[PDB]
Design a binder for these strands. Structure first.
Lengths: 112, 94, 251, 122, 123
RNA sequence: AAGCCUCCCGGUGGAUGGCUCGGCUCGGGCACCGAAGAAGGGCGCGGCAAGCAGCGAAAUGCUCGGGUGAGGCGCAAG
RNA sequence: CCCGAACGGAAACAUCUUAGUAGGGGGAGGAAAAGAAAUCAAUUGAGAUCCCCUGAGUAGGGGCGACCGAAAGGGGGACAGC
RNA sequence: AGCAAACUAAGUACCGUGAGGGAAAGCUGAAAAGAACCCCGGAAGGGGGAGUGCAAAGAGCCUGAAACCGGGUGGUUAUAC
RNA sequence: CCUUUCGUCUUGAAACACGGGCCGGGGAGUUCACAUCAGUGGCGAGCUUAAGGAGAUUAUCUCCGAAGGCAUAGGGAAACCAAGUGCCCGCAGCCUAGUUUCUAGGCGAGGGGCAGGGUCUGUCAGGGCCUGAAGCCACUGAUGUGAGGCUAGAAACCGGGCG
RNA sequence: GGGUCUCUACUAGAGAUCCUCUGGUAGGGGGGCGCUGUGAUGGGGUAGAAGGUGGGUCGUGAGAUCCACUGGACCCGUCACA
């Protein structure tokens, strides 16, 4: 129903990396079953300066040790400032397509 | 029921019929907080009696050495606070 | 980035709008908030609770034949039933029906932001119907516009800044509507015109411009979706003052 | 602070009482009359001279010989129509379709009512 | 262009009228179709000698469907401002003037469409 | 000839469409009358007056103040 | 303010519910009634009555079946006392 | 339809010994200009010719459907569903 | 040349089964409350205001009002006690090599299996419930239940009056 | 119905191409037509409207639209809602 979520799904499918096609397929789940992740789980299953791709919303339960770059549909405002305060970065799925390192990124993890 | 819906009762209706036990008129009301949840008030000594908390539970664990004043605590909470370097004072009321 | 105009339409400044006005326009969200505020102004209707039942009609039974059916009839003639003439309604309207649609306060405030951005997009303003020859949208006027007191010299301002073509569009009143609405006081149907947002109520311009056909005046801290997107369609032509932007920046 | 319902507006004008029926008979004065009387409109009585501004007989000027205060119409001398047998009958024209050309100033209570309505000095 | 009568001319069309439209006038005067549902109904059962049921296999070729019999695409015009929005051009549309437009505006509406080269049905 | 089908014209009929000084629901005001005879009813009163409304043997209306300004004798045109 | 049902539901029905309802008799007013603790609750606190949102289908009653059902406390509106 | 009641008298007419029950029914036209006069008829907002009006479904008056009936057009009919 | 009279209950009925002369108009799953699912939207370890108060262009609108509710810890009749981690498989995806063409090899969020932990019970093994961090609110729809409850239909029973 | 692609401020439309499937009651599911009113609108139409009678054309269909006569003042397309 969202105009911008529909235009994002149509451009992810045009991408030629299986990572982005899987994100578009996952964003078409029923809203009641859409994916999300908390900060504590990103911390447990990652290393410093990783790249985490979440096909949903990032929520702020738990704490973060190491700096990471997280790519997600949306961020909770308490969760966004937890990530930046530990030295990390945040991008939207729209900007991650165009980024030059994200053109040919390495050490990328897909999480939920 | 017991006549024609008793096929439902014997399978999905345990406790539908009968009495079991009693209620205590004078049960003590206890407000419990765990170690995992204690890391927020609500965003060095911590006095938990001020916020209406009675017992401290084992939960997960803390991250800093703290002094906690509660009426009661669990055995796991007492030992895990010592490991970080904290200490628990059992004061029933401040 | 927009320019500020004086009462003669000349450019004299250059300011940057808050980041609210760059939000995407979400027609699904604006329709949620408009339909909620619309249903808050509806009154409860209902029928007479006893209409059709003010009788003691009863069934005659069987074996009469001439009492053609087991229907209720009062000494011969039909009464009380939903299929008979002069009987009761089967499901009459009642005052118990729920009319209002709620929205969350946080969801409402996002819908107002989305509508405020649609008035800064020239594509949505031209696609809603409005006619204007100004090259800048929205129009930002100096605060001396607050003190205009005569409806004749409001029209002189709208001509200079290039908005009076929307007044002519409105002034071609869409005459008498169709239906039973005209029987009930709803005789005409008029187009919507430019909207004026001012710093505070009680300013002179609130009353002076209240007669101009199609226009509405509202304070910067009261405005909502019913003003920005009437009918559910975003992009109403809007005029702001310099100090109404600062009041908006704090929401 | 009165009702905007069309049925409530029409029930007033069809049941208007005797002392308020003068409102149905209001007509515009000519430009020369308002020079020397200082008012813009007045109610019509028998004996005034009246000229038509609308209708199939526009421009016709005569004198008022009858009034219908319940409906707000006037009859002008010389503006008639003949029946089947040939006896003429009057053509009734609403008081809002005419402009008053001269008054009958002989009541002495109509005259000070006009003065009370702010004729300039006398 | 030559593919307009290969599907239409030989295949004269069925009317698809409601059951018992010829026995009762209350049913025959509607001249519309209603789906049979009776347990014993004979058009529902598709017996022999009983006027086919409505099915989706009766559609028309998609390349000629909905065209004016002159082979163009019909456009219903209610105002002179609808003429200025002519797509492509006069090569593929036929103009249908609205019935309620009065005689004085029709004179100016037909003149505008003539100079554009458009083709009018009810001229 | 009895006729039969279709359209046209007419009759009979009163659907459809349009209209509305009537209802229906909400808000807001306001809120007791009576032995100094109430509410409710019955009979009367108009030049010709049967009904409704108004009135009570002073009976389609009497007196005194104020407003209004030319017609008036209700529905209802003799 | 007194007197006071049955139909129906319980898949029958009598305790129960329906319901102190429907109804009957008496008495007012522009509002009535209530109203200044022989009250609540719990480590010594609050402070007349009434109405709204709650507490809450909780405590509790019941062929412990169908079903029935508070108060204190919290937030407000008005907030007098003789 | 909306209150049972938009109208020449609604709880009115009318029905019941009574407690009680309980209808139907709106619309000429902008203006009556509501059809003078002549022939027919016992008479009739009756017929015919006129006349009024933007227009006579002109008083049984806005529009005027179907069932039903009468007259006419086009096919056809007394050896056969 | 081909073709039995519509709707219906019913194995079939279906007709010597029932309702059906013609035409017009009317005529039957609706409302509220609670619960549970779904499609979407907002915020998110939180969510949400109710009654109400203030203002205003005065039944719309704006600001305030988290009281309470649901969720966040469970087990037990009760006294009372009180968790959230480590092993193995492994889909998607990522990396490496060959892209010969790819379960070839690593890493593997979500998922599965064994265990662990809290509490009741047993004299041990055991047995019951819980614990691997996602909910609340809104609109719309579906169903259950309660109210007349898709529409029509009893014989009856009771209260007060009238003969 | 499914696989593979294109375009569009997209609760949806418009297309290209390859494979396969086609009776149906109770019943479950997906899309559309029509009626009355409300907020809007590139929007419009009218003394020549709505309605009526007969007839053309479009659509599998519910339906849409036009022509001639009748009629004498109101009525429709699109988006959303009830």
């Amino acid at each position: 129903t969202n105009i911008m979520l529909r235009k994002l799904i149509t451009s992810l499918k045009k991408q030629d990396k299986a990572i982005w096609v899987r994100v578009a397929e996952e964003l078409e789940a029923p809203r009641r079953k859409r994916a999300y992740i908390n900060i504590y789980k990103i911390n447990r299953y990652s290393k410093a300066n990783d790249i985490i791709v979440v096909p949903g919303k990032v929520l702020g339960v738990g704490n973060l040790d190491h700096p990471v770059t997280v790519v997600a549909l949306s961020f909770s405002k308490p969760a966004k400032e937890k990530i930046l305060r530990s030295g990390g970065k945040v991008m939207s799925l729209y900007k991650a397509i165009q980024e030059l390192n994200d053109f040919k990124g390495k050490t990328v993890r897909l999480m939920k | 029921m017991h006549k024609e819906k008793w096929s439902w009762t014997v399978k999905f209706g345990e406790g539908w019929y009968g009495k079991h036990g009693f209620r205590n008129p004078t049960s003590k009301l206890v407000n419990a907080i765990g170690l995992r949840k204690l890391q927020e008030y609500i965003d060095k000594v911590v006095d938990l009696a001020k916020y209406g908390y009675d017992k401290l539970l084992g939960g997960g664990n803390l991250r800093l050495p703290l002094v906690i004043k509660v009426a009661k605590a669990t055995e796991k909470a007492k030992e895990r606070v010592k490991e970080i370097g904290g200490e628990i004072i059992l004061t029933s009321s401040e | 980035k927009v320019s500020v105009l004086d009462l003669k339409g000349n450019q004299l400044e250059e300011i940057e709008l808050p980041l609210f006005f760059s939000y995407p326009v979400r027609k699904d969200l604006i329709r949620r908030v408009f339909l909620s505020e619309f249903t808050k102004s509806l009154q409860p209707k209902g029928r007479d609770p006893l209409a059709g039942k003010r009788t003691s009609a009863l069934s005659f039974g069987i074996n009469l034949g001439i009492a053609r059916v087991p229907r209720v009839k009062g000494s011969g003639e039909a009464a009380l039933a939903p299929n008979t003439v002069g009987g009761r309604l089967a499901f009459p309207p009642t005052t118990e029906k729920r009319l209002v649609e709620e929205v969350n306060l946080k969801e409402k405030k996002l819908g107002i932001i989305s509508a405020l951005a649609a008035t800064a997009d020239p594509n949505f303003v031209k696609a809603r119907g409005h006619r204007f020859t100004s090259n800048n949208v929205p129009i930002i006027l100096v605060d001396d516009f607050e003190n205009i007191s005569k409806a004749k010299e409001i029209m002189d301002i709208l001509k200079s800044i290039g908005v009076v073509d929307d007044i002519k569009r409105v002034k071609e009143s869409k005459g008498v509507r169709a239906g039973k609405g005209k029987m009930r006081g709803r005789r005409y149907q008029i187009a919507k015109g430019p909207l004026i947002v001012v710093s505070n109520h009680k300013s002179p311009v609130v009353e002076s411009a209240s007669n101009i056909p199609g226009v509405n005046v509202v304070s910067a801290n009261l405005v909502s979706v019913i003003h920005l997107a009437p009918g559910g369609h975003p992009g109403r032509l809007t005029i702001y003052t310099k100090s109404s932007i600062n009041i908006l920046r704090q929401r | 602070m009165i009702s905007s319902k069309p049925s409530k507006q029409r029930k007033l004008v069809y049941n208007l009482p005797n002392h308020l029926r003068y409102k149905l008979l209001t007509a515009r004065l000519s430009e020369d009359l308002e020079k020397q009387y200082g008012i813009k409109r007045i109610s019509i009585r028998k004996g005034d001279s009246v000229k038509l501004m609308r209708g199939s007989q526009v421009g016709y000027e005569g004198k008022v010989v009858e009034v219908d205060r319940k409906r707000g119409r006037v009859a002008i001398e010389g503006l008639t129509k003949k029946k089947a047998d040939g006896t003429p009958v009057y053509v009734w024209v609403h008081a809002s379709k005419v402009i008053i050309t001269k008054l009958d100033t002989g009541d002495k209570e109509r005259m000070d009512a006009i003065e009370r309505k702010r004729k300039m000095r006398e | 262009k030559p593919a307009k009568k290969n599907m239409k001319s030989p295949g004269k069309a069925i009317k698809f009228l409601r059951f018992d439209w010829d026995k009762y006038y209350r049913i025959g005067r509607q001249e519309r179709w209603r789906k049979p549902r009776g347990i014993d109904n004979a058009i529902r059962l598709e017996l022999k000698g009983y006027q086919p049921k409505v099915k989706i296999g009766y559609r028309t070729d998609k390349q000629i469907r909905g065209l004016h019999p002159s082979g163009l695409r019909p456009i219903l015009v209610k105002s002179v401002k609808d003429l200025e929005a002519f797509a492509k051009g006069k090569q593929d549309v036929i103009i249908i003037i609205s019935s309620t437009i009065g005689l004085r505006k029709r004179i100016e509406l037909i003149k505008k469409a003539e100079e554009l080269g458009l083709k009018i049905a009810n001229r």
